[PDB]
Amino acid sequence: MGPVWRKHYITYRINNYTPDMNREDVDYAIRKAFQVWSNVTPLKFSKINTGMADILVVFARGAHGDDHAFDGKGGILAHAFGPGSGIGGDAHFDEDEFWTTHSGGTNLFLTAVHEIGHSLGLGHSSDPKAVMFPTYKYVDINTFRLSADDIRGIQSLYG
Amino acid sequence: MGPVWRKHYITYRINNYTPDMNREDVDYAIRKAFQVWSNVTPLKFSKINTGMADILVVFARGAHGDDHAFDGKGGILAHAFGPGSGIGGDAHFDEDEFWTTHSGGTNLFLTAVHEIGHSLGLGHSSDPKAVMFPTYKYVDINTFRLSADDIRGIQSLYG
Ligand SMILES: CC(C)[C@H](C(=O)NO)N(CCNC(=O)c1cccc(C(=O)NCCN([C@@H](C(=O)NO)C(C)C)S(=O)(=O)c2ccc(-c3ccccc3)cc2)c1)S(=O)(=O)c1ccc(-c2ccccc2)cc1
Ligand SMILES: [Ca+2]
Ligand SMILES: [Ca+2]
Ligand SMILES: [Ca+2]
Ligand SMILES: [Ca+2]
Ligand SMILES: [Ca+2]
Numbered sequence: 244m245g246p247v248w249r250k251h252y253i254t255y256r257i258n259n260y261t262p263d264m265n266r267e268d269v270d271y272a273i274r275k276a277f278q279v280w281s282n283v284t285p286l287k288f289s290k291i292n293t294g295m296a297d298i299l300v301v302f303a304r305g306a307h308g309d310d311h312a313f314d315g316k317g318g319i320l321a322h323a324f325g326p327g328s329g330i331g332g333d334a335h336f337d338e339d340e341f342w343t344t345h346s347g348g349t350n351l352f353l354t355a356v357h358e359i360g361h362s363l364g365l366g367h368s369s370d371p372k373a374v375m376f377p378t379y380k381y382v383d384i385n386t387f388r389l390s391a392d393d394i395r396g397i398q399s400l401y402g
Numbered sequence: 403m404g405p406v407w408r409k410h411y412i413t414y415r416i417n418n419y420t421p422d423m424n425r426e427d428v429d430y431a432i433r434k435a436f437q438v439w440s441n442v443t444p445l446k447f448s449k450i451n452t453g454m455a456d457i458l459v460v461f462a463r464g465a466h467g468d469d470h471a472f473d474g475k476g477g478i479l480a481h482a483f484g485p486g487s488g489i490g491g492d493a494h495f496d497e498d499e500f501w502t503t504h505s506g507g508t509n510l511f512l513t514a515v516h517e518i519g520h521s522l523g524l525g526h527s528s529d530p531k532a533v534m535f536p537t538y539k540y541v542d543i544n545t546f547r548l549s550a551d552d553i554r555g556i557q558s559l560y561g
């Protein structure tokens with residue numbers, strides 16, 4: 244393995260909101276995305292509105308302060324840093340994308356699941372069924388499930 | 403090092419056409435895509451309409467006889483085999499994608515530039531500026547350029 248979180252209780256904070264969606268929708272998509280991963284691991288995720296969280300969720304465009312500039316609409320959608328102090332664990336979403344509760348844009352839920360995988364220490368999967376496979380494909384949020392390879396990946400890091 | 407073409411006169415043939423575009427907008431996009439690479443290499447590319455070619459261009463959907471099935475709309479866009487006989491060099495475009503002369507779909511020209519890169523022996527690039535960076539972004543065909551990295555890579559396979 245590379246790095247992992249050495250604790251099981253992990254906090255996140257939503258730094259700022261995208262204007263593409265309602266604030267309630269953004270909270271919900273993010274909360275469900277963490278739930279995908281807490282469902283298959285010992286990890287507990289807790290939303291914090293003050294103080295400093297382990298995992299900061301940020302919407303930004305272009306050069307946004309971290310040597311990995313976003314690229315305007317399309318292309319790179321998002322990135323996240325592996326477990327660590329400071330910017331480690333943080334997930335950044337390209338505001339030049341159009342974020343959506345369902346399809347017809349870039350689905351925030353699905354992307355957040357992918358990115359949180361990174362935040363927890365996963366790399367990319369060679370398996371096209373896996374959410375950690377590095378191409379975006381819309382699947383209905385209600386029918387989305389982690390693949391065998393996703394779970395095997397995360398359980399090897401956290402039991 | 404991976405295989406390369408041993409000869410300099412390389413042929414391609416378009417096996418079938420996507421209905422998403424005029425037959426001739428497809429020829430144009432493909433021809434321009436080859437031109438991108440012949441401009442920076444000794445290689446020359448000729449289209450043939452019958453007989454055996456070096457690079458067969460295919461539009462297929464799902465499983466189509468090569469162990470790398472496509473995945474329906476979205477996700478994977480296309481794939482191509484490195485130099486060699488038989489399947490070698492062939493370039494397969496996912497028919498479930500919606501192919502376009504511009505945007506409002508997946509641009510055939512830009513995607514063909516990427517796949518031909520594979521047909522000529524190139525792997526992916528970690529440089530986002532590179533066309534061999536494995537992420538699609540639309541850019542007007544007039545403004546598109548190979549990056550220093552792409553050119554460096556191809557000029558280090560061919561002479
Ligand atoms: C820059 C990174 C950090 C970033 C990301 O990871 N953030 O977490 N991107 C991913 C960029 N790609 C990679 O890092 C990477 C690394 C190694 C291998 C690959 C790879 O093979 N990707 C697929 C390439 N495909 C094919 C291909 O290479 N054909 O030649 C085949 C062989 C599978 S592809 O069909 O998707 C394809 C991709 C791009 C082009 C292309 C490129 C330039 C011009 C025209 C077309 C053509 C085909 C990708 S990212 O694009 O922001 C990204 C991608 C997906 C998701 C995601 C996934 C599941 C659910 C929701 C969202 C989130 C973000
Ligand atoms: Ca982008
Ligand atoms: Ca952090
Ligand atoms: Ca936006
Ligand atoms: Ca061939
Ligand atoms: Ca596809």
Ligand SMILES: [Ca+2]
Nearest residue numbers: 497498499500
């Ligand atoms: Ca199609």
Ligand SMILES: [Zn+2]
Nearest residue numbers: 307309311335
């Ligand atoms: Zn960032």
Ligand SMILES: [Zn+2]
Nearest residue numbers: 357361367377
């Ligand atoms: Zn990723």
Ligand SMILES: [Zn+2]
Nearest residue numbers: 466468470494
């Ligand atoms: Zn194929």
Ligand SMILES: [Zn+2]
Nearest residue numbers: 516520526536
């Ligand atoms: Zn590729």
